[PDB]
PDB file of all heavy atoms in Angstrom:
ATOM      1  N   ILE C 171     -56.913  58.183  30.870  1.00 23.68           N
ATOM      2  CA  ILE C 171     -58.003  59.029  30.649  1.00 23.68           C
ATOM      3  C   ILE C 171     -57.780  59.714  29.305  1.00 23.68           C
ATOM      4  O   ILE C 171     -56.747  60.493  29.116  1.00 23.68           O
ATOM      5  CB  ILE C 171     -58.268  60.047  31.786  1.00 23.68           C
ATOM      6  CG1 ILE C 171     -58.661  59.214  33.061  1.00 23.68           C
ATOM      7  CG2 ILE C 171     -59.204  61.030  31.437  1.00 23.68           C
ATOM      8  CD1 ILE C 171     -58.535  59.989  34.371  1.00 23.68           C
ATOM      9  N   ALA C 172     -58.662  59.546  28.358  1.00 25.08           N
ATOM     10  CA  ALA C 172     -58.488  60.168  27.067  1.00 25.08           C
ATOM     11  C   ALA C 172     -59.007  61.521  26.902  1.00 25.08           C
ATOM     12  O   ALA C 172     -58.486  62.300  26.050  1.00 25.08           O
ATOM     13  CB  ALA C 172     -59.243  59.167  26.001  1.00 25.08           C
ATOM     14  N   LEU C 173     -59.875  61.943  27.734  1.00 25.16           N
ATOM     15  CA  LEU C 173     -60.461  63.387  27.619  1.00 25.16           C
ATOM     16  C   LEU C 173     -60.788  63.665  28.990  1.00 25.16           C
ATOM     17  O   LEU C 173     -61.589  62.979  29.761  1.00 25.16           O
ATOM     18  CB  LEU C 173     -61.730  63.260  26.880  1.00 25.16           C
ATOM     19  CG  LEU C 173     -62.444  64.645  26.729  1.00 25.16           C
ATOM     20  CD1 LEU C 173     -61.581  65.758  26.200  1.00 25.16           C
ATOM     21  CD2 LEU C 173     -63.768  64.422  25.970  1.00 25.16           C
ATOM     22  N   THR C 174     -60.304  64.963  29.422  1.00 25.69           N
ATOM     23  CA  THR C 174     -60.523  65.469  30.715  1.00 25.69           C
ATOM     24  C   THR C 174     -61.358  66.731  30.588  1.00 25.69           C
ATOM     25  O   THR C 174     -61.016  67.570  29.845  1.00 25.69           O
ATOM     26  CB  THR C 174     -59.132  65.759  31.372  1.00 25.69           C
ATOM     27  OG1 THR C 174     -58.417  64.572  31.594  1.00 25.69           O
ATOM     28  CG2 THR C 174     -59.175  66.464  32.748  1.00 25.69           C
ATOM     29  N   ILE C 175     -62.298  66.827  31.427  1.00 25.58           N
ATOM     30  CA  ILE C 175     -63.341  67.934  31.307  1.00 25.58           C
ATOM     31  C   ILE C 175     -63.661  68.583  32.688  1.00 25.58           C
ATOM     32  O   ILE C 175     -64.660  68.302  33.402  1.00 25.58           O
ATOM     33  CB  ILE C 175     -64.687  67.592  30.700  1.00 25.58           C
ATOM     34  CG1 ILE C 175     -64.500  66.551  29.615  1.00 25.58           C
ATOM     35  CG2 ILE C 175     -65.487  68.673  30.285  1.00 25.58           C
ATOM     36  CD1 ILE C 175     -65.758  65.990  28.936  1.00 25.58           C
ATOM     37  N   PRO C 176     -62.727  69.465  33.268  1.00 23.86           N
ATOM     38  CA  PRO C 176     -63.002  70.088  34.405  1.00 23.86           C
ATOM     39  C   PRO C 176     -64.042  71.288  34.209  1.00 23.86           C
ATOM     40  O   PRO C 176     -63.852  72.092  33.235  1.00 23.86           O
ATOM     41  CB  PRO C 176     -61.665  70.725  35.010  1.00 23.86           C
ATOM     42  CG  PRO C 176     -60.632  69.982  34.044  1.00 23.86           C
ATOM     43  CD  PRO C 176     -61.280  69.783  32.685  1.00 23.86           C
ATOM     44  N   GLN C 177     -65.036  71.491  35.046  1.00 25.47           N
ATOM     45  CA  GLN C 177     -66.059  72.437  34.898  1.00 25.47           C
ATOM     46  C   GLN C 177     -66.035  73.393  36.096  1.00 25.47           C
ATOM     47  O   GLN C 177     -66.254  72.954  37.232  1.00 25.47           O
ATOM     48  CB  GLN C 177     -67.329  71.741  34.711  1.00 25.47           C
ATOM     49  CG  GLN C 177     -68.758  72.619  34.591  1.00 25.47           C
ATOM     50  CD  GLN C 177     -69.907  71.732  34.694  1.00 25.47           C
ATOM     51  OE1 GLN C 177     -69.903  70.606  35.020  1.00 25.47           O
ATOM     52  NE2 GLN C 177     -71.018  72.371  34.372  1.00 25.47           N
ATOM     53  N   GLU C 178     -65.949  74.687  35.915  1.00 24.31           N
ATOM     54  CA  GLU C 178     -65.795  75.755  36.915  1.00 24.31           C
ATOM     55  C   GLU C 178     -65.016  75.228  38.151  1.00 24.31           C
ATOM     56  O   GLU C 178     -65.582  75.297  39.316  1.00 24.31           O
ATOM     57  CB  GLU C 178     -67.252  76.112  37.301  1.00 24.31           C
ATOM     58  CG  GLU C 178     -68.101  76.621  36.287  1.00 24.31           C
ATOM     59  CD  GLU C 178     -69.476  77.242  36.578  1.00 24.31           C
ATOM     60  OE1 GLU C 178     -69.418  78.104  37.578  1.00 24.31           O
ATOM     61  OE2 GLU C 178     -70.533  76.808  36.201  1.00 24.31           O
ATOM     62  N   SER C 179     -63.771  74.930  37.943  1.00 26.35           N
ATOM     63  CA  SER C 179     -62.977  74.366  38.858  1.00 26.35           C
ATOM     64  C   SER C 179     -62.244  75.400  39.796  1.00 26.35           C
ATOM     65  O   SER C 179     -61.792  75.091  40.993  1.00 26.35           O
ATOM     66  CB  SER C 179     -61.852  73.426  38.295  1.00 26.35           C
ATOM     67  OG  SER C 179     -61.071  74.125  37.406  1.00 26.35           O
ATOM     68  N   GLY C 180     -62.091  76.598  39.304  1.00 26.79           N
ATOM     69  CA  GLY C 180     -61.542  77.735  39.992  1.00 26.79           C
ATOM     70  C   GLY C 180     -60.157  77.505  40.682  1.00 26.79           C
ATOM     71  O   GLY C 180     -59.323  76.848  40.164  1.00 26.79           O
ATOM     72  N   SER C 181     -60.054  78.129  41.806  1.00 20.85           N
ATOM     73  CA  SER C 181     -58.792  78.093  42.675  1.00 20.85           C
ATOM     74  C   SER C 181     -58.523  76.676  43.002  1.00 20.85           C
ATOM     75  O   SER C 181     -59.503  75.978  43.623  1.00 20.85           O
ATOM     76  CB  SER C 181     -58.843  78.918  43.868  1.00 20.85           C
ATOM     77  OG  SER C 181     -57.684  78.849  44.591  1.00 20.85           O
ATOM     78  N   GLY C 182     -57.397  76.138  42.867  1.00 24.91           N
ATOM     79  CA  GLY C 182     -56.926  74.874  43.016  1.00 24.91           C
ATOM     80  C   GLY C 182     -57.297  73.920  41.995  1.00 24.91           C
ATOM     81  O   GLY C 182     -57.087  72.658  41.941  1.00 24.91           O
ATOM     82  N   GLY C 183     -58.060  74.491  40.837  1.00 23.39           N
ATOM     83  CA  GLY C 183     -58.299  73.757  39.620  1.00 23.39           C
ATOM     84  C   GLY C 183     -57.455  74.358  38.450  1.00 23.39           C
ATOM     85  O   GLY C 183     -56.298  74.286  38.588  1.00 23.39           O
ATOM     86  N   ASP C 184     -58.226  74.918  37.549  1.00 21.06           N
ATOM     87  CA  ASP C 184     -57.450  75.411  36.301  1.00 21.06           C
ATOM     88  C   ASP C 184     -57.063  76.822  36.550  1.00 21.06           C
ATOM     89  O   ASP C 184     -56.571  77.454  35.604  1.00 21.06           O
ATOM     90  CB  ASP C 184     -58.264  75.310  35.062  1.00 21.06           C
ATOM     91  CG  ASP C 184     -59.644  75.976  35.020  1.00 21.06           C
ATOM     92  OD1 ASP C 184     -59.914  76.788  35.923  1.00 21.06           O
ATOM     93  OD2 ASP C 184     -60.343  75.807  34.037  1.00 21.06           O
ATOM     94  N   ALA C 185     -57.105  77.432  37.696  1.00 23.45           N
ATOM     95  CA  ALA C 185     -56.490  78.716  38.055  1.00 23.45           C
ATOM     96  C   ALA C 185     -55.177  78.482  38.624  1.00 23.45           C
ATOM     97  O   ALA C 185     -54.852  77.390  39.309  1.00 23.45           O
ATOM     98  CB  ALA C 185     -57.270  79.513  39.003  1.00 23.45           C
ATOM     99  N   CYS C 186     -54.215  79.424  38.483  1.00 24.69           N
ATOM    100  CA  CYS C 186     -52.878  79.313  39.012  1.00 24.69           C
ATOM    101  C   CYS C 186     -52.723  80.082  40.275  1.00 24.69           C
ATOM    102  O   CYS C 186     -53.290  81.052  40.468  1.00 24.69           O
ATOM    103  CB  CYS C 186     -51.960  79.921  38.013  1.00 24.69           C
ATOM    104  SG  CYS C 186     -51.207  78.881  36.621  1.00 24.69           S
ATOM    105  N   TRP C 187     -51.995  79.467  41.225  1.00 23.88           N
ATOM    106  CA  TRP C 187     -51.758  80.112  42.624  1.00 23.88           C
ATOM    107  C   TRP C 187     -51.190  81.480  42.454  1.00 23.88           C
ATOM    108  O   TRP C 187     -51.654  82.394  43.122  1.00 23.88           O
ATOM    109  CB  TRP C 187     -50.820  79.231  43.445  1.00 23.88           C
ATOM    110  CG  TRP C 187     -51.297  77.755  43.631  1.00 23.88           C
ATOM    111  CD1 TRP C 187     -50.517  76.655  43.360  1.00 23.88           C
ATOM    112  CD2 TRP C 187     -52.520  77.323  44.228  1.00 23.88           C
ATOM    113  NE1 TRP C 187     -51.258  75.551  43.678  1.00 23.88           N
ATOM    114  CE2 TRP C 187     -52.490  75.867  44.250  1.00 23.88           C
ATOM    115  CE3 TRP C 187     -53.609  77.978  44.728  1.00 23.88           C
ATOM    116  CZ2 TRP C 187     -53.484  75.138  44.760  1.00 23.88           C
ATOM    117  CZ3 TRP C 187     -54.719  77.155  45.316  1.00 23.88           C
ATOM    118  CH2 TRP C 187     -54.599  75.756  45.309  1.00 23.88           C
ATOM    119  N   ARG C 188     -50.132  81.712  41.604  1.00 22.79           N
ATOM    120  CA  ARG C 188     -49.518  82.856  41.589  1.00 22.79           C
ATOM    121  C   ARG C 188     -50.366  83.991  40.872  1.00 22.79           C
ATOM    122  O   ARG C 188     -50.345  85.150  41.445  1.00 22.79           O
ATOM    123  CB  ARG C 188     -48.230  82.795  40.593  1.00 22.79           C
ATOM    124  CG  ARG C 188     -47.073  82.174  41.321  1.00 22.79           C
ATOM    125  CD  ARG C 188     -46.034  81.767  40.168  1.00 22.79           C
ATOM    126  NE  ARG C 188     -44.720  81.243  40.673  1.00 22.79           N
ATOM    127  CZ  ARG C 188     -44.526  80.114  41.142  1.00 22.79           C
ATOM    128  NH1 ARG C 188     -45.562  79.206  41.190  1.00 22.79           N
ATOM    129  NH2 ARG C 188     -43.187  79.688  41.484  1.00 22.79           N
ATOM    130  N   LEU C 189     -51.227  83.547  39.946  1.00 22.26           N
ATOM    131  CA  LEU C 189     -52.175  84.608  39.445  1.00 22.26           C
ATOM    132  C   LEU C 189     -53.278  84.955  40.320  1.00 22.26           C
ATOM    133  O   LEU C 189     -53.634  86.136  40.376  1.00 22.26           O
ATOM    134  CB  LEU C 189     -52.686  84.083  38.055  1.00 22.26           C
ATOM    135  CG  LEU C 189     -51.704  83.693  36.967  1.00 22.26           C
ATOM    136  CD1 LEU C 189     -52.308  83.387  35.670  1.00 22.26           C
ATOM    137  CD2 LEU C 189     -50.829  84.903  36.760  1.00 22.26           C
ATOM    138  N   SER C 190     -53.683  83.951  41.128  1.00 23.86           N
ATOM    139  CA  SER C 190     -54.766  84.275  42.098  1.00 23.86           C
ATOM    140  C   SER C 190     -54.137  85.186  43.213  1.00 23.86           C
ATOM    141  O   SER C 190     -55.023  86.014  43.771  1.00 23.86           O
ATOM    142  CB  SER C 190     -55.398  83.001  42.715  1.00 23.86           C
ATOM    143  OG  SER C 190     -56.006  82.242  41.626  1.00 23.86           O
ATOM    144  N   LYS C 191     -53.030  85.042  43.666  1.00 25.00           N
ATOM    145  CA  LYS C 191     -52.423  85.882  44.624  1.00 25.00           C
ATOM    146  C   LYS C 191     -52.423  87.351  44.068  1.00 25.00           C
ATOM    147  O   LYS C 191     -52.796  88.360  44.702  1.00 25.00           O
ATOM    148  CB  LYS C 191     -51.046  85.455  44.954  1.00 25.00           C
ATOM    149  CG  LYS C 191     -50.168  86.415  45.752  1.00 25.00           C
ATOM    150  CD  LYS C 191     -50.756  86.710  47.149  1.00 25.00           C
ATOM    151  CE  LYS C 191     -49.784  87.628  48.048  1.00 25.00           C
ATOM    152  NZ  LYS C 191     -50.585  88.149  49.149  1.00 25.00           N
ATOM    153  N   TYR C 192     -51.945  87.554  42.744  1.00 25.58           N
ATOM    154  CA  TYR C 192     -52.162  88.784  42.118  1.00 25.58           C
ATOM    155  C   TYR C 192     -53.565  89.245  42.167  1.00 25.58           C
ATOM    156  O   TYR C 192     -53.764  90.527  42.553  1.00 25.58           O
ATOM    157  CB  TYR C 192     -51.574  88.710  40.769  1.00 25.58           C
ATOM    158  CG  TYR C 192     -51.629  89.906  39.830  1.00 25.58           C
ATOM    159  CD1 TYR C 192     -50.712  91.020  40.147  1.00 25.58           C
ATOM    160  CD2 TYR C 192     -52.565  90.134  38.932  1.00 25.58           C
ATOM    161  CE1 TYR C 192     -50.744  92.233  39.398  1.00 25.58           C
ATOM    162  CE2 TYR C 192     -52.467  91.274  38.090  1.00 25.58           C
ATOM    163  CZ  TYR C 192     -51.609  92.269  38.341  1.00 25.58           C
ATOM    164  OH  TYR C 192     -51.720  93.464  37.586  1.00 25.58           O
ATOM    165  N   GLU C 193     -54.624  88.495  41.860  1.00 23.67           N
ATOM    166  CA  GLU C 193     -55.860  88.961  41.904  1.00 23.67           C
ATOM    167  C   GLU C 193     -56.348  89.453  43.217  1.00 23.67           C
ATOM    168  O   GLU C 193     -56.926  90.523  43.346  1.00 23.67           O
ATOM    169  CB  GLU C 193     -56.853  87.854  41.352  1.00 23.67           C
ATOM    170  CG  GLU C 193     -56.611  87.537  39.915  1.00 23.67           C
ATOM    171  CD  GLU C 193     -58.029  86.960  39.419  1.00 23.67           C
ATOM    172  OE1 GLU C 193     -59.068  87.631  39.548  1.00 23.67           O
ATOM    173  OE2 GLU C 193     -58.052  85.854  38.903  1.00 23.67           O
ATOM    174  N   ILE C 194     -56.035  88.705  44.248  1.00 26.03           N
ATOM    175  CA  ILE C 194     -56.512  89.036  45.581  1.00 26.03           C
ATOM    176  C   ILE C 194     -55.823  90.302  46.095  1.00 26.03           C
ATOM    177  O   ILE C 194     -56.493  91.095  46.759  1.00 26.03           O
ATOM    178  CB  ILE C 194     -56.445  87.769  46.559  1.00 26.03           C
ATOM    179  CG1 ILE C 194     -57.486  87.962  47.705  1.00 26.03           C
ATOM    180  CG2 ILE C 194     -55.009  87.766  47.128  1.00 26.03           C
ATOM    181  CD1 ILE C 194     -57.589  86.688  48.560  1.00 26.03           C
ATOM    182  N   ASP C 195     -54.585  90.423  45.800  1.00 24.91           N
ATOM    183  CA  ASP C 195     -53.768  91.612  46.218  1.00 24.91           C
ATOM    184  C   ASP C 195     -54.463  92.849  45.581  1.00 24.91           C
ATOM    185  O   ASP C 195     -54.288  93.975  46.002  1.00 24.91           O
ATOM    186  CB  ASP C 195     -52.366  91.391  45.926  1.00 24.91           C
ATOM    187  CG  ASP C 195     -51.588  90.482  46.736  1.00 24.91           C
ATOM    188  OD1 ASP C 195     -52.283  90.098  47.815  1.00 24.91           O
ATOM    189  OD2 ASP C 195     -50.476  90.223  46.393  1.00 24.91           O
ATOM    190  N   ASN C 196     -54.988  92.729  44.429  1.00 22.43           N
ATOM    191  CA  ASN C 196     -55.518  93.830  43.665  1.00 22.43           C
ATOM    192  C   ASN C 196     -57.089  93.944  43.749  1.00 22.43           C
ATOM    193  O   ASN C 196     -57.728  94.804  43.085  1.00 22.43           O
ATOM    194  CB  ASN C 196     -55.111  93.748  42.135  1.00 22.43           C
ATOM    195  CG  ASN C 196     -53.734  94.074  41.980  1.00 22.43           C
ATOM    196  OD1 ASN C 196     -53.299  95.261  42.007  1.00 22.43           O
ATOM    197  ND2 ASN C 196     -52.826  93.106  41.827  1.00 22.43           N
ATOM    198  N   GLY C 197     -57.652  93.286  44.806  1.00 21.47           N
ATOM    199  CA  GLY C 197     -59.061  93.635  45.122  1.00 21.47           C
ATOM    200  C   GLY C 197     -60.117  92.777  44.645  1.00 21.47           C
ATOM    201  O   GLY C 197     -61.278  92.958  44.931  1.00 21.47           O
ATOM    202  N   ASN C 198     -59.833  91.937  43.711  1.00 22.48           N
ATOM    203  CA  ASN C 198     -60.883  90.870  43.352  1.00 22.48           C
ATOM    204  C   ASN C 198     -61.060  89.900  44.533  1.00 22.48           C
ATOM    205  O   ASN C 198     -60.078  89.365  45.109  1.00 22.48           O
ATOM    206  CB  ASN C 198     -60.423  90.090  42.206  1.00 22.48           C
ATOM    207  CG  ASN C 198     -60.675  90.827  40.734  1.00 22.48           C
ATOM    208  OD1 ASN C 198     -61.475  91.813  40.752  1.00 22.48           O
ATOM    209  ND2 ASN C 198     -60.135  90.355  39.823  1.00 22.48           N
ATOM    210  N   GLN C 199     -62.261  89.597  44.810  1.00 23.37           N
ATOM    211  CA  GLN C 199     -62.599  88.631  45.931  1.00 23.37           C
ATOM    212  C   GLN C 199     -62.516  87.171  45.527  1.00 23.37           C
ATOM    213  O   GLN C 199     -63.604  86.443  45.337  1.00 23.37           O
ATOM    214  CB  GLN C 199     -63.946  89.052  46.650  1.00 23.37           C
ATOM    215  CG  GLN C 199     -63.919  90.422  47.176  1.00 23.37           C
ATOM    216  CD  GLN C 199     -65.336  91.099  47.337  1.00 23.37           C
ATOM    217  OE1 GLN C 199     -66.331  90.589  46.901  1.00 23.37           O
ATOM    218  NE2 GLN C 199     -65.290  92.345  47.928  1.00 23.37           N
ATOM    219  N   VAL C 200     -61.300  86.691  45.271  1.00 21.59           N
ATOM    220  CA  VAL C 200     -61.011  85.384  44.752  1.00 21.59           C
ATOM    221  C   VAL C 200     -60.650  84.445  45.848  1.00 21.59           C
ATOM    222  O   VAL C 200     -60.267  84.964  46.975  1.00 21.59           O
ATOM    223  CB  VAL C 200     -59.969  85.436  43.705  1.00 21.59           C
ATOM    224  CG1 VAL C 200     -60.119  86.461  42.517  1.00 21.59           C
ATOM    225  CG2 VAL C 200     -58.490  85.728  44.383  1.00 21.59           C
ATOM    226  N   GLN C 201     -60.844  83.157  45.647  1.00 25.45           N
ATOM    227  CA  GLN C 201     -60.341  82.265  46.374  1.00 25.45           C
ATOM    228  C   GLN C 201     -58.751  82.078  46.124  1.00 25.45           C
ATOM    229  O   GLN C 201     -58.394  82.246  44.841  1.00 25.45           O
ATOM    230  CB  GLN C 201     -61.005  80.834  46.176  1.00 25.45           C
ATOM    231  CG  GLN C 201     -60.439  79.737  47.007  1.00 25.45           C
ATOM    232  CD  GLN C 201     -61.456  78.432  46.949  1.00 25.45           C
ATOM    233  OE1 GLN C 201     -61.899  78.056  45.770  1.00 25.45           O
ATOM    234  NE2 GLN C 201     -61.812  77.911  48.189  1.00 25.45           N
ATOM    235  N   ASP C 202     -57.917  81.883  47.014  1.00 26.32           N
ATOM    236  CA  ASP C 202     -56.456  81.758  46.924  1.00 26.32           C
ATOM    237  C   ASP C 202     -55.911  80.733  47.671  1.00 26.32           C
ATOM    238  O   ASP C 202     -56.547  79.925  48.514  1.00 26.32           O
ATOM    239  CB  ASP C 202     -55.817  83.213  47.172  1.00 26.32           C
ATOM    240  CG  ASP C 202     -55.685  83.448  48.655  1.00 26.32           C
ATOM    241  OD1 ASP C 202     -56.543  83.124  49.469  1.00 26.32           O
ATOM    242  OD2 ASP C 202     -54.579  83.934  49.044  1.00 26.32           O
ATOM    243  N   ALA C 203     -54.552  80.431  47.476  1.00 29.28           N
ATOM    244  CA  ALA C 203     -53.810  79.399  48.229  1.00 29.28           C
ATOM    245  C   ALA C 203     -54.003  79.499  49.735  1.00 29.28           C
ATOM    246  O   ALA C 203     -54.195  78.523  50.427  1.00 29.28           O
ATOM    247  CB  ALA C 203     -52.440  79.363  47.809  1.00 29.28           C
ATOM    248  N   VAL C 204     -53.888  80.740  50.254  1.00 33.67           N
ATOM    249  CA  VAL C 204     -54.038  80.871  51.614  1.00 33.67           C
ATOM    250  C   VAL C 204     -55.357  80.439  52.183  1.00 33.67           C
ATOM    251  O   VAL C 204     -55.355  79.753  53.280  1.00 33.67           O
ATOM    252  CB  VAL C 204     -53.495  82.302  52.075  1.00 33.67           C
ATOM    253  CG1 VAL C 204     -53.629  82.536  53.594  1.00 33.67           C
ATOM    254  CG2 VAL C 204     -52.215  82.655  51.472  1.00 33.67           C
ATOM    255  N   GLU C 205     -56.401  80.999  51.537  1.00 32.83           N
ATOM    256  CA  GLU C 205     -57.634  80.535  52.133  1.00 32.83           C
ATOM    257  C   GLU C 205     -57.968  79.067  51.844  1.00 32.83           C
ATOM    258  O   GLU C 205     -58.601  78.437  52.685  1.00 32.83           O
ATOM    259  CB  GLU C 205     -58.821  81.424  51.496  1.00 32.83           C
ATOM    260  CG  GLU C 205     -60.162  81.237  52.163  1.00 32.83           C
ATOM    261  CD  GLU C 205     -60.999  80.061  51.478  1.00 32.83           C
ATOM    262  OE1 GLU C 205     -60.570  79.480  50.438  1.00 32.83           O
ATOM    263  OE2 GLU C 205     -62.129  79.694  52.008  1.00 32.83           O
ATOM    264  N   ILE C 206     -57.663  78.535  50.691  1.00 33.35           N
ATOM    265  CA  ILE C 206     -58.118  77.214  50.433  1.00 33.35           C
ATOM    266  C   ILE C 206     -57.648  76.084  51.327  1.00 33.35           C
ATOM    267  O   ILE C 206     -58.345  75.117  51.580  1.00 33.35           O
ATOM    268  CB  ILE C 206     -57.818  76.929  48.854  1.00 33.35           C
ATOM    269  CG1 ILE C 206     -58.854  75.841  48.402  1.00 33.35           C
ATOM    270  CG2 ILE C 206     -56.397  76.489  48.679  1.00 33.35           C
ATOM    271  CD1 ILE C 206     -58.719  75.850  46.831  1.00 33.35           C
ATOM    272  N   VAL C 207     -56.463  76.312  51.885  1.00 30.50           N
ATOM    273  CA  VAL C 207     -55.893  75.171  52.719  1.00 30.50           C
ATOM    274  C   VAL C 207     -56.619  75.318  54.055  1.00 30.50           C
ATOM    275  O   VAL C 207     -56.607  74.186  54.797  1.00 30.50           O
ATOM    276  CB  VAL C 207     -54.338  75.241  52.871  1.00 30.50           C
ATOM    277  CG1 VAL C 207     -53.676  74.924  51.581  1.00 30.50           C
ATOM    278  CG2 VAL C 207     -54.013  76.684  53.463  1.00 30.50           C
ATOM    279  N   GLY C 208     -57.354  76.315  54.383  1.00 31.69           N
ATOM    280  CA  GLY C 208     -58.013  76.300  55.708  1.00 31.69           C
ATOM    281  C   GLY C 208     -59.402  75.924  55.421  1.00 31.69           C
ATOM    282  O   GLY C 208     -60.187  75.519  56.592  1.00 31.69           O
ATOM    283  N   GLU C 209     -59.933  75.959  54.276  1.00 31.01           N
ATOM    284  CA  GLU C 209     -61.329  75.636  53.979  1.00 31.01           C
ATOM    285  C   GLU C 209     -61.579  74.166  53.891  1.00 31.01           C
ATOM    286  O   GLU C 209     -62.706  73.643  54.175  1.00 31.01           O
ATOM    287  CB  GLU C 209     -61.625  76.352  52.703  1.00 31.01           C
ATOM    288  CG  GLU C 209     -63.119  76.076  52.375  1.00 31.01           C
ATOM    289  CD  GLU C 209     -63.465  76.776  50.999  1.00 31.01           C
ATOM    290  OE1 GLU C 209     -63.222  77.914  50.821  1.00 31.01           O
ATOM    291  OE2 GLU C 209     -64.172  76.013  50.246  1.00 31.01           O
ATOM    292  N   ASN C 210     -60.581  73.351  53.333  1.00 28.84           N
ATOM    293  CA  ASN C 210     -60.827  71.897  53.019  1.00 28.84           C
ATOM    294  C   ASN C 210     -59.578  71.194  53.008  1.00 28.84           C
ATOM    295  O   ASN C 210     -58.535  71.678  53.420  1.00 28.84           O
ATOM    296  CB  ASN C 210     -61.649  71.871  51.709  1.00 28.84           C
ATOM    297  CG  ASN C 210     -62.643  70.770  51.717  1.00 28.84           C
ATOM    298  OD1 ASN C 210     -62.283  69.639  52.043  1.00 28.84           O
ATOM    299  ND2 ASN C 210     -63.979  71.130  51.549  1.00 28.84           N
ATOM    300  N   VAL C 211     -59.644  69.938  52.484  1.00 31.05           N
ATOM    301  CA  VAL C 211     -58.496  69.055  52.626  1.00 31.05           C
ATOM    302  C   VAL C 211     -58.056  68.529  51.190  1.00 31.05           C
ATOM    303  O   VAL C 211     -57.613  67.555  50.962  1.00 31.05           O
ATOM    304  CB  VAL C 211     -58.770  67.898  53.515  1.00 31.05           C
ATOM    305  CG1 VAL C 211     -59.070  68.424  54.884  1.00 31.05           C
ATOM    306  CG2 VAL C 211     -60.046  67.156  53.139  1.00 31.05           C
TER     307      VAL C 211
END
C-alpha cells in the first residue's frame, strides 16, 4: 500500500492506548482499551 488514509479512526486507530487511559482518568468521555474490547471484535 503506497498511501494510507485513516479517517476519524479514534480509539484503536490513530489514538494511543496509554494516552486514552490518561484522558478517561481525567474526565474526557473517550473510548479506551477497557471499553473497546467489550464493544466489538
Side-chain angles (χ1 to χ4, degrees):
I171 293 164
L173 174 64
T174 297
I175 316 176
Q177 179 189 8
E178 301 190 53
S179 63
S181 179
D184 62 8
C186 272
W187 303 121
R188 285 168 172 79
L189 300 186
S190 298
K191 170 65 176 163
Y192 180 73
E193 290 206 58
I194 205 172
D195 288 350
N196 285 283
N198 279 344
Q199 300 157 354
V200 309
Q201 187 166 45
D202 76 317
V204 180
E205 185 274 351
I206 202 167
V207 292
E209 182 185 312
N210 215 306
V211 294

